[PDB]
């Protein structure tokens, strides 16, 4: 397979015109979103986004709501502090992004933990792999680093990532076992399209697959064709599966000299296919 993970992705945006900010947090197990929070929602709560989390009881929902509400407040202050460190105008909107989480090893222990920040899209501050020290991107982030050293923030993170994060992840994998722990292989085929030159486009499709990780390549006589190929970003189907394609222009009549190759964890071994009308 590959390692499973639990992650949270949060976005804070300042709104000077309104005297406030907006905080949006989403949680994922692997490629599957399962919770959301939006501080603009009336009566804002942590809310379910996958069916298998709805079995958690009231204490879970109250506790998670209290903790994400508190983060939204702290991140509103952090927006103001960072504006000051950079001597930016009070009228402009800025963005503070936060990502943290845990990957699970094959023995059930933490494989890798992370906790990191960006300001206006640029790296700001990050927890090192050791979970015992921080790396700052500039003179402003050094100020924040010294506060977190003084407060022993790393000890708290180390404890959360090795303990609560891994433990929660293992519970969610069990609650959603029938969907999360099952891979679905791609359905594949090659199409042919008349093209603006006397070249023909061949397009290799992979459809209906989970998880999202996949390789699609083209060869002619053992020779990889990546330098002239268009490969689109992997995209959601909307039902928990994904799609991708790879296309290239070939001379007319020569279509069957080309092979598409597909690798995915749902396949028993790698696939070779060609234009097969």
């Amino acid at each position: 397979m590959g390692p499973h993970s639990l992650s949270y992705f949060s976005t804070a945006v300042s709104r000077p015109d309104r005297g406030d900010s907006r905080f949006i947090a989403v949680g994922y197990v692997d490629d599957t979103q399962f919770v959301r929070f939006d501080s603009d929602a009336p009566n804002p709560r942590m809310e379910p986004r996958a069916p298998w989390i709805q079995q958690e009881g009231q204490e879970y929902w109250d506790r998670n709501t209290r903790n994400v509400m508190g983060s939204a407040q702290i991140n509103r202050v952090n927006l103001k502090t960072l504006r000051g460190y950079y001597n930016q105008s009070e009228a402009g909107s800025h963005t503070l992004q936060w990502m943290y989480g845990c990957y699970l090893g094959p023995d059930g222990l933490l494989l890798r933990g992370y906790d990191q920040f960006a300001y206006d899209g640029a790296d700001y501050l990050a927890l090192n792999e050791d979970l015992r020290s921080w790396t700052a991107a500039d003179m402003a982030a050094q100020i924040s680093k010294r506060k977190w050293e003084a407060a022993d923030a790393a000890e708290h993170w180390r404890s959360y990532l090795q303990g609560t994060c891994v433990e929660s992840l293992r519970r969610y994998l069990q609650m959603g076992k029938d969907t999360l722990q099952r891979a679905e292989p791609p359905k594949t085929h090659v199409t042919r399209h008349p093209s603006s030159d006397l070249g023909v486009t061949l397009r290799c499709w992979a459809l209906g697959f989970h998880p999202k990780e996949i390789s699609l390549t083209w060869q002619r006589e053992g020779q990889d064709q990546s330098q002239d190929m268009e490969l689109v970003e992997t995209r959601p189907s909307g039902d928990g599966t994904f799609q991708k394609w790879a296309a290239l222009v070939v001379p007319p009549g020569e279509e069957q000299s080309y092979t598409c190759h597909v690798q995915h964890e749902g396949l028993q071994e790698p696939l070779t296919l060609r234009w097969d009308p």
Binding site: Y8, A25, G27, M46, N64, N67, V68, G70, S71, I74, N75, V77, N78, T81, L82, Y100, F117, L125, I143, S144, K147, W148, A151, A153, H156, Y160, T164, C165, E167, S168
Partner: peptide
């Protein structure tokens, strides 16, 4: 499970 102590920058 969401973390429970967000730090001031």
């Amino acid at each position: 499970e969401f973390e429970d102590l967000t730090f001031l920058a």
